[model samples]
Target: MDVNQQYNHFLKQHVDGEMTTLKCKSQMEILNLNRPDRKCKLKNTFILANPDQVQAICTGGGTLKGNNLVQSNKPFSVVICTHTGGESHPNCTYKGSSATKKVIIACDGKFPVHYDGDVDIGITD
Candidate 1:
């Protein structure tokens, strides 16, 4: 399946103010890039959709260069919190600092197959 398709599938079900306790965990599992102990939780996630937006958030660095994928300049990001308590219920609580990651969706102008990069957690929209 295409990476963007996977991303869109995952995001459509998980991101924004849409996810709930019943669905959040499994959806996150599918998107964690095959990690054992997924630390950061997806509190919020979205695509930037424009070069200006990407440039603004990725200021410390410049354009990304590679021949692997054709990205939309803009990318996805997520708001995450480390501590939570909801193993089997909808009573999770977050504590301390939250972090963000700049996501790159590797596409072929139509379908995205993979992704890379977890840029700084300081950029804000």
Candidate 2:
């Protein structure tokens, strides 16, 4: 078979679960930006998504950027926005905060719950 035929065959087999695993090297690197006289702080957002359902919401709010700072405080509830509400989708467990501003959409970590594009995520104080 030509390159195109061979590629298509592989893709078909993979989709059929003929190949269950793909492997690659895991790389780790660290860099420090603080200079002799200056202090630096880093912050970022992390979102977790599974099957389009809003699984979990996290604040991840902190001035220090490190795994140690990852707050164990999960949202009071976890709501599955756009959920089908049945055996296929199940229940919505999202718990809104007294201050919704602190809660973030777990799908992308940017969209807020109840926003135009956000799932109907609710939290109770």
Candidate 3:
């Protein structure tokens, strides 16, 4: 789906405050993105969850080249490499195959260059 659709979905399911976040195992256990059947669309820049998952961010409002979720919107741009199983960056969490939705969008690396692997933990509305 596109931004409008995704955003609307968030709004519909939103039952909390204006801002929200998920972290650590919550990204997987809560959002349940750790399932093959469950998937998220990456067509825009969004915020990374508390566990550092990218959920409530921008749809690439700045330089498009720097935004993967916005630039490509691929299912596993930064999350999964289904065919190849290996270790990600040092900071990245071991999401494994369960991360079938969207992609791990660190955007500009929340920390430093290659210092931490970008991983989205939860969602926001």
Candidate 4:
């Protein structure tokens, strides 16, 4: 019933994050990069695709293993933001860069709750 909120949150926080245009630091501010409660955050990954495209993984276009899913057919442009400052609110600064990689997300069939990791893009980094 409330799954829409989850999907919407996923969109708001990750999918539409325009790090390519806005860059990090600023986008972090725009997106309020932190915990949902606006606590401390060190890094985040944003999928640079329309929410509709990202959602394909949740419904069918992905492979499910455990509670996570990996997009089986798409490699999306992605932005990675890493914190450079304190882990507290407002003191946080970030450096971000873009890449193309396969993505993995944790979904509950409504939205992805986690970026989980990215493939071959140093999710190992």
Candidate 5:
């Protein structure tokens, strides 16, 4: 997929899904980002908010870019999904925790194509 498509797909696969009981296995299945052969990623981070809010990060106030790396003007609440088991796609295990962070992403045309980093200077329940 092109960068635009990746931006959209990333919103669906990695962004959204803010919930009280965030089960990693189920959410992975719902997002269709599960690895069939093995645990493909050690961890994935997500914003615990709506997709619209995430998209806003690209164009929101204070948005700045150093090359393709775009930094959000506003901070966001996040969930860190950590890999806990090496199982197949359907059974892969993960633990999700809450955090508040400043976001950095790889952008294409004012849209975020990749999640690059999270500044965890802030985190809490």
Candidate 6:
């Protein structure tokens, strides 16, 4: 597949956080920029449809660049995001946090078209 096709495939499989077992070493690697300490793990990432939804979900502002989704209300070089937490039977949890780095993503339809940096900042929602 070409770049677009490959990117679409990557989005469908990884962005939604539905298929947790899918191995995405190479895909996550593309997002691992300016963040060498943290890794974009599927277990700690959440995917939204659009910037409006992000605003609704975040209660803050966001921006879209190409396929990148960036939170704009926070301080520069810092981003606030959410994700699903561990599923330990009936005691599953969710969390929210702010990282000292930016979170950027590309949009396509109801999902992210691409990730420009590490997505999982150890926060879950």
Top lDDT: which candidate number? Answer: 4
Q: How would you encode candidate 3's per-residue C-alpha lDDT over 1-125 as one tens digit per residue?
A: 22444333332222122222222223323332432433331111222223212332333321234433332243321222121222322223322222323433223322211111123223111
* TM-scores, all models, native as reference: 0.31, 0.15, 0.24, 0.74, 0.70, 0.25
Supply the TM-score for candidate 1: 0.31
Q: What C-alpha lDDT does candidate 1 achieve relative to the native structure? A: 0.38
For residue 87, model 3's alpha carbon misses the true position, in angstroms, by 15
Candidate 5 per-residue lDDT, tens place, 79-116, comes to: 77676875456566778787666776665665667543
lDDT of 4 by residue, 41-117 (tens): 56667787887788787777766655455553567778888877765667777777777877777677646664422
lDDT by residue (tens digit), candidate 1, 16-112: 4433334445444444434334434434333323433432323432234366333333335444433265432233344333234445434334333
RMSD of each: 8.3, 20.4, 13.4, 4.5, 5.0, 11.5
Ranking by TM-score: 4, 5, 1, 6, 3, 2
Q: Which ten residues in a row are the worst by lDDT in model 6?
A: 74-83
Best by TM-score: 4
Alpha-carbon lDDT, every model: 0.38, 0.21, 0.27, 0.64, 0.59, 0.36
Ten contiguous residues minimizing lDDT sum, candidate 2: 23-32
Could you give me the TM-score of model 3 versus the true structure?
0.24
Per-residue CA lDDT of model 6 for 15-90, tens digit only, reads 4423222323333334432235433333334342333443332334445443244443332222223225432322
Which runs in model 6 stand beyond 4 Å of their true positions?
A: 1-23, 37-44, 60-125
**Consecutive 10-residue window with the lowest summed lDDT within model 1:** 114-123
Question: For residue 87, what is the lDDT in candidate 4?
Answer: 53
Full ranking by lDDT: 4, 5, 1, 6, 3, 2
